[PDB]
Each structure stands twice: as C-alpha cells, then as structure tokens.
Amino acid sequence: TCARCDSXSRCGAXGKXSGXAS
Amino acid sequence: AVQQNKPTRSKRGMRRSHDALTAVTSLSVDKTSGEKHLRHHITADGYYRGRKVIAK
Amino acid sequence: MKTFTAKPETVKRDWYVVDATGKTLGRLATELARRLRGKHKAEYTPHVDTGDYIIVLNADKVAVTGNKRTDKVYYHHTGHIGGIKQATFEEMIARRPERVIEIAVKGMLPKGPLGRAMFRKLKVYAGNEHNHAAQQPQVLDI
Amino acid sequence: VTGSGKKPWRQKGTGRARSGSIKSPIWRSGGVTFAARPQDHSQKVNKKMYRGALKSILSELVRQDRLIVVEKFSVEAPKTKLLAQKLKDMALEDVLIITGELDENLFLAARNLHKVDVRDATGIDPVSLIAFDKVVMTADAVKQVEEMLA
Amino acid sequence: ARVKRGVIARARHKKILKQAKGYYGARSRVYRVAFQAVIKAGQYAYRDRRQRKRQFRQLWIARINAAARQNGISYSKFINGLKKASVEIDRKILADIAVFDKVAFTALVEKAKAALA
Amino acid sequence: METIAKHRHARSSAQKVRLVADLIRGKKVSQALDILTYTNKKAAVLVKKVLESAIANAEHNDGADIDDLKVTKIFVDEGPSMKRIMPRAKGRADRILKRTSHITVVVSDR
Amino acid sequence: MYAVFQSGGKQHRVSEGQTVRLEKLDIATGETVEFAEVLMIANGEEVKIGVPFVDGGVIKAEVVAHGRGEKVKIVKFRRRKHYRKQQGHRQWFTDVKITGISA
RNA sequence: GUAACGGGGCUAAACCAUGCACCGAAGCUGCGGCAGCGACGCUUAUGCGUUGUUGGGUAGGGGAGCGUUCUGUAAGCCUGCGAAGGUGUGCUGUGAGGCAUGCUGGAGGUAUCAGAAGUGCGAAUGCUGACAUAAGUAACGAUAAAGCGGGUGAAAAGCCC
RNA sequence: CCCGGCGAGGGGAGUGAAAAAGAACCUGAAACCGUGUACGUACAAGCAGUGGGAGCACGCUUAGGCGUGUGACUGCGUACC
C-alpha cells in the first residue's frame, strides 16, 4: 500500500499528501 | 463516524425488531377454475376474474 | 431464624382525611411523607410500600410562616433555550394549590420506583369535599 | 532459525506493533528464547562419600535379610533353563548375583532374564543394590568387596 | 521436557466462567470480562458481609421505634428504660416481638416506662 | 413422527434465510407452501424445496396424510463461509465472506 | 409459649420443638444441654426479666448435629497496586433441638 | 438551569449556654475458627483443655506449598465390565487445588517417594488461526440507452434469433 | 428407492462394533450464531454486581418456612492494567 495523506505525520488520514503511507 | 464500543447482540436484535416480513395470507380463489392466485393478478394458467385471459 | 419481611401482597392499607387548614407546610408534609412510607407500623419493610392512603383537603388554605408567602419561589426548567421558569408561593396557591403539598411531599419521599408508588397514595384537594367516600376514610389529626 | 534478518515492516507508521525479525521468539515459527544446548549432567561424587554410601546400603542389605552368601554359584553349561530351575530352587525371584571372578557361563545364563542380574564384585553400583530384592554374593565376592571398600 | 498448557489453562478458565453464571453479556461468556466481574463480586461480598449487620441493625431500630410510638414512647426513652431496668434483650428480638407478639411488647414498654421514672 | 429435510451448504446468508423461515414456523404445510410460493425472496425458493422434500420423505419413508402435517421445527444454522479477496482503492485488500447456510425443516403430523 | 436465650453471644427466640443453629459448643452429639440464662419466657401471661436473667426458668435441648455451613469466599483486591488474596472459610455450627421450656 | 443549606422544607428543624438520652466504624467487647513470635501447668519422635502478644500493605527481603510434562520405583498397579481428553453434578482443603461418579469418548494412564524443567498468561499498538462489530449498511467501476415478439431452459432484464 | 434441474443437498435401505466413523471423514473445546422451554422485562435512569427480598416455575420430604432457575423492589457500589 502506499498512498500518503497528511501534512506531516508518519501515517495519519488527511486528504493532503506528504505524510502518510502506512 | 465510527463506533467507540461494540454494540451488543441485544441491541442488534432490537435493531432487527422491524426487519420482519409481513406474510401475505390474502390469496384469492378464481371462480372458474378454482386456482389460488394473488389478489388482482392473473393465475399460473392465466385466468382473471372468471373469464379467460392471456395464456400458459 | 430470619428477620420478618412484609409480603407486598398481604399489606393492609387504610384511608385517612387530613385537613391542611392553617397548618405549616413542611411540618404537615413530613408527617404525610412519614405515614405514606409506613414508618408508623411495626411491620415496616424498606423495600415494600407498607404505608397508608392519605387524602389531603383544603390545600389552598395551607399556612407558611415568616415572609414566605411572597418570597418562597418554585423553580422548574422546561428543557429548552430559555427554560428557567419561576413562580412564587402565592402564585402557586392562586394557580394550582395541589402542587404545593405535592412538591413538598415528593421532596420528602425517597427516589426511585417505590417512592413514586408511595407518592401515588396521596390525594390532594383544594376544596373541602372529596370523592373517596366509598373508601371510608377515618379522620386523621395532623 | 532459517530465515532472513530483515525488518518485516518499518519502525513507525503502520498500525502494527513494532517488530524487527521474523525469527523473534514471540512470533510463530521461529521461537525458543533460551534454547537448549547438548549438556553433561554428571555430578561429582567424592571417593569417601561414594564408599560411605556403598557401606550404608550394603549394611542395610545385611540387616534387612536381603543378602545371601554362598560358597560357589555357577552353572555347567550356558543355558538359561538350568539357572531358571536353580533360582526356583533357592526361592529367588528378583535377584542380583555378584561374583568375585567374572564368569561367562553365568553371564550368558542370565542375560535373557530381567529379574536376574549378574555383576562382578568390581562392577557394583549403588542403585542396583537397592533395586533388586535379594543380593547373592559369592564368598570370594565378599572378600573382594571388603577389600575394595574396607 | 516441553509442557503444553491447554488442559490446565482450560480448567483455570472454566472455574472463572463457572463462577460468572447469571452475569450480563460478556461478563458470563468472556474470560477477560468475567475475571474482573468475579473479583468485583468478591470485593462486594467482603464489603457487604459488613454492610449486612449495619442494615439489619437499621431495620430493627426502625421497627422498635415504630412499635414504641405505637405504644406511646420514643426509641431513645425506651432503650433508656431497658437499660435502667437491666434488660439485655437485643434489637433483633425486640423487633421480632414488635412484629409477632404485640402484647409482650406492650409488657416490655410498660417495664421501660416504669424504669424510666 | 418427525421427518427431517436439510439443505446443507446453501449459498445464502443465514440472516436472509431466517427471515423467511420465521414465516412458516408452526403453520400447516399446505398453507406454508402457498406462503412460500407467493413470497418474493430467494430464500423462499431455497426453503420451499426443503419443505417439499420433507413432505416427500414423510410420504415415502414412513408418514401419513399430508393434510395433517405441521411445520413444527424450522431452523437455519451458519455454514462454512468462503474467503475471497476484494481489491479496494489505494492498494488495500478487503476480504469477502461468502456466507453459507444449513436449512433444516422438521415436519411432523402430530 | 416461646423463650429468649443466649448461647454464642447472640440471642434466640424459640418455641417447643424448633431446631436452632448455634455456634459450636463443646458438647457431644447426644447430651441434652441446659441453657440456664434465659431472658424472656412468654405466653398470654408472660414472665419477663427484671434483673437480666429469669431465675426460675431453664431451657433444655438435644444436640442433633455438628457441622459446617457454606464455604464463603474472602477476596482482598487492591487495584493498580499489585495485590489480591483469595481465601475460603467454613464456619462450625451445632444444630440443637429444643425439647423443653421450663417456665 | 433553580445552582453560595445536598434536597425537601424550617421562625426552629437557626445561633449561644447547660445537661441527659439515643444513633453512629471493619474501633472496643461477646461467641466460634486459623496462623506467626516469646515463654509457663503435663512432659521427648512433644501434642496441646492451655495461656501472653501479634496478623492492612507497594518496591523489596524471608518462609512454606500446589499444579503441569518427562525419568526412576515400574515387565509393578488401574484400564474394551471402558484409559487419556471433553461436558455436568456432588463432596472436600485456608489457597493453588483434590476426590467420586452421570453422559460423550474409544486406548492408553499412573499411586507414593525422589529427580529434571521449553513448568503456570489478560495486557507487551505481542505472533498465528478462527469468529464478531459497524451491517445485510456503503457500494455493484464512466449518464453511449434501451423496448418488444419468438426460441432454448428447472428458471431469461442480461444467452440465441 | 423417494424429493430436486439426467443438480447441489437431504431422507430411507444397506456395510460396519460404531455413520453420536460418509470422505467438508478419530476425539470435537472456546469465542460466535440459532431453535425450544421456565422466569423476568414496554413510568423507568448510570462499571450491570453485591446484601436483603416478594412472586412464579420445578424437584422435595409425606407439613417444617430448605435446594435449582428467574429476580419486581430496596441499601451500597464510577472496570482492569
């Protein structure tokens, strides 16, 4: 899997996209 | 928009309390051939209200 | 052996007429809530409603002391935006004087289902006549 | 454990607990935390302690009527039927024969019997003099045991 | 020597689930919840073996005060009258006489009234 | 006399078939067949075959007198579900449980 | 006619022929015990106490059974502080049978 | 939202002074039971009718035990007239536990006293498998669009014409 | 052999010691999900228990106020790590 999604976390949800691949 | 505690099987059966099917029980009898049919519908042989209709 | 428990299906109840004319409100209401609970009977069980039926009449002629007739305020909240509503003692007397005795007694009774079934044995009246003459209420001097 | 030493999922950011190896002992197929090695379970017995134990057990074989001493106990031909009849004569069911000089015909005539054992006076051990019901010593075997232990 | 756990673990779980019968939901079906429920019932049993004596004492005193006021004396004056007469009957038996034998209780009230003055 | 018919491993969820099996419990079997004939569910088609097979197993094996029979005991149990993969968005794999049933109809004239 | 006596620090109200579960006495299972400390004998006309013992009354009872009651469970639990005790307890009792009230 | 006695209510059911009553704890006492330490009556493989006192407890120290698998005892003892395991019931120990049987099971278990441990799980966003919950809910993947007659068939909106 | 679509699945018959061994096959635990029965529940507020406790159901002994199941009502009681 690999789509990212937060402004800046390691893995949260968020509709943005530079922080986030679980 | 997600749950914080799993609902019980009591609450699950209470939600399904209104999911029950109303049985029909109102089948009409054709007067010509004596066949059971739905009320206001044709028969499996195809009569309706006594007189002959479609086919089959 | 075990301590006696009054069975709730063979409790013998009586009927009483109390005239609330000129008596103090809470000083009458605590003897009301005493006899409604059954504290005057030697067979008293706390989880059973062993008390009596009580008929209160002339409840618009009840007396309070001090300056409480123009200054004792009853508050109820309706459950809304503004909600808080506010009536004094003599407004309650002019409006529905049964609720004065009933609020006093319901406050002096326990909470829960059994306390409500104790409150159900209270028949308050703003007049001198009642309707339970079939029940033969022997007169109570409170 | 046969397997690779790479990290299964990266340190931060999945929903999983952190792991470092498929060979972790708290994971399936790849366990034992304190796995056994082949080891030697032998204990040291002092010479005087071993001989004091043999003297105590052989004294109890005397005092509990579990010791028989005969002049000679042998057999003419190596067949177990002769020793079977011979030990049924002497009322001996579960028996430890002990002989001074090590015999061959007596070693073959009792090799098949499990109730019977045959030892030299040199080859005594503490756990067999307690195990068998009766102990039949030769008089030469009593002389050799009394030499070896004193 | 490798020791499998399943039989003794199953016995130790079945004891706790057997002590959890009657309970609601996972409290009677699930070992994690039922263990906490069984320990909580144990704490309640410990606390309420003490609470029982207090509650029955309350009930006995309420019935003694009821029947004494049925006879015309309060509780405190009546217990004063039974101390000033050297009467050692406890409050359980006085509540039992107040329920079942009102004439014997009237006799005890007359005794305590005569001793009270 | 009880007479049992089963549809084991029926490809329908147990919750769907119980909603039709609760229509015809305690009914006479002649009335239950018409209830299942004019019911617009797929489970009615599944449970009508089991009811008809119970009628026939009664008639052929021991039985009596089809006018007498009642549907005394009807129940649906959960069967072995099939495990399937459903791809979703962003490389996530869901599983599909393809749930099966066991349908049991006991017919008995007394 | 009933009677109030006192055996194990507790008091008992009893009639002619009841079985009373007392605390354990050092009396064998056939001896008839006599409680001479009786607090009230009652009837239609009743002998109460003045001084705390009825001087001219005595109760006699046949000792029926020695035994132990229900096993009770003591649970001491201290949450978040790493402590619990489980303990069992059965209490000894003596079932006596009141054979005689002597007014 | 009454909201500065907990509440009802109170002109005492408020405050001060004098008392006597009474309620009130797991405190003290009464009855029964267990255990730890120090010591007297009878007396030793010392048991106690005894009797002084003690017995909340985290980190931690000390003492005593239960259960599980495997080894000796044991080519012994139980067991197809029913073992292990599973599921109830009863009895019993202060506890871990133990004993006996109903049913299921269908071939192995193991007294006592010693020995050795992969020896006891509820947590580690533990690991594997199974099954829930949300829920019969979202969705069924381009808004290019279908309608009828006949055929086949157990059954046709979708197949063939 | 019968139901069903020359189905799947089942009911008999038969093999067997056993189909409470039918191949989705020894034993068959728990979570989970049902059917039937007994009791409770639609004016009542909260870690769901505990202490008391009526009524009901079912075994009792040949009354004895006790067992088993449910638990109206009531005092106390804000999980575990």
* Contact at CB, G42 and E104, closer than 8 angstroms: yes
* Contact at CB, E98 and C3, closer than 8 angstroms: no
Closest-CA distance, C81 to chain E, in angstroms, reads 39
Residue F38 CA to nucleotide H159 C1', Å? Answer: 27
- Per the structure, the residues numbered 42 to 101 in protein chain G that have their CB within 7 angstroms of any atom of strand I are 77, 79-80, 82
Contact indicator for F30, F89 with CB cutoff of 8 Å = no
| Identity of the amino acid at C114 | L
Strands (E), chain E: none
Please state, as a whole number, how many other Cβ atoms lie within 10 Å of the Cβ of residue C114: 16
CA atoms of D144 and D98, how far apart (whole Å): 11
What are residue G20's DSSP bridge partners? Answer: G96
* Contact at CB, G84 and E39, closer than 8 angstroms: yes
Domain ranges across chain F: 1-110
- Per the structure, the residues numbered 54 to 93 in protein chain F that have their CB within 7 angstroms of any atom of strand I are 56-57, 59-61, 73, 75-78, 80
Nearest CA in chain B to F18: B20
CA atoms of F70 and E111, how far apart (whole Å): 77
Q: Which of residues 1-22 of A touch D (CB under 8 A)?
A: 10-11, 20-22
Resolution at which this structure was determined, Å: 2.9
Cα separations in angstroms, F85 against A21, E92, F11, F100: 22, 72, 18, 17
Strands (E), chain C: 15-19, 53-57, 73-77, 84-88, 122-124, 138-139
Q: Does E88 touch chain G (CB under 8 A)?
A: yes
Q: Does E85 touch chain G (CB under 8 A)?
A: yes
Q: Do chains C and E touch (3 or more CB pairs under 8 A)?
A: yes
Contact indicator for G36, G61 with CB cutoff of 8 Å = no
Q: Which domain holds residue G47?
A: 1-103
Cβ contacts of A3 on chain F, cutoff 8 Å? 90-91
Residue F28: closest CA among F81, F68, F85: F68
How are strands ordered across the β-sheet holding G2-6?
A: G11-15, G2-6, G38-42
Contact indicator for A3, A21 with CB cutoff of 8 Å = yes
Domain count, chain G: 1
Q: Does A2 touch chain F (CB under 8 A)?
A: yes
The one-character DSSP state at G38 is: E
Q: Give every CB contact of residue D42 below 8 A, 6+ residues apart in sequence.
A: none
CA atoms of F12 and F76, how far apart (whole Å): 11
CA atoms of E38 and E14, how far apart (whole Å): 13
What's the longest Cα–Cα distance across chain B?
A: 63
Nucleotide nearest to E32 (CA to C1'): H122
Domains and CATH numbers, chain D: 1-149 (3.40.1370.10)
Domain ranges across chain C: 1-142
What's the longest Cα–Cα distance across chain G?
A: 63
Nearest CA in chain A to F87: A1
Contact indicator for F30, F67 with CB cutoff of 8 Å = yes
Please state, as a whole number, how many other Cβ atoms lie within 10 Å of the Cβ of residue D41: 4
CA atoms of C5 and E109, how far apart (whole Å): 23
CA atoms of C116 and C110, how far apart (whole Å): 8
Strands (E), C2-59: 15-19, 53-57
Q: Could you identify the residue written with the tokens 């015309």?
A: E72
Q: Give every CB contact of residue E22 below 8 A, 6+ residues apart in sequence.
A: E28
Domain ranges across chain B: 1-56
Q: What was the elucidation method?
A: cryo-EM
Q: Could you identify the residue written with the tokens 């489970």?
A: F43
The secondary structure of chain D as a DSSP string is --S--S-SS-SSSSSSPP---TT-TTSSSS--TT-------PPP--HHHHHHHHHHHHHHHHHTT-EEEES----SSS-HHHHHHHHHHTT-SSEEEEESSPPSHHHHTTSS-SSEEEEESSS--HHHHHHSSEEEEEHHHHHHHHHHH-
Please state, as a whole number, how many other Cβ atoms lie within 10 Å of the Cβ of residue G102: 14
Instruction: Assign a CATH topology to domain F1-110.
Output: Ribosomal Protein L22; Chain A (3.90.470)
For chain F, list the contacting chains (3+ Cβ pairs, <8 Å): A, B
Cβ contacts of B27 on chain F, cutoff 8 Å? 34, 38
Contact indicator for D108, D78 with CB cutoff of 8 Å = yes
C1' of nucleotide H57: residue with nearest CA: G83
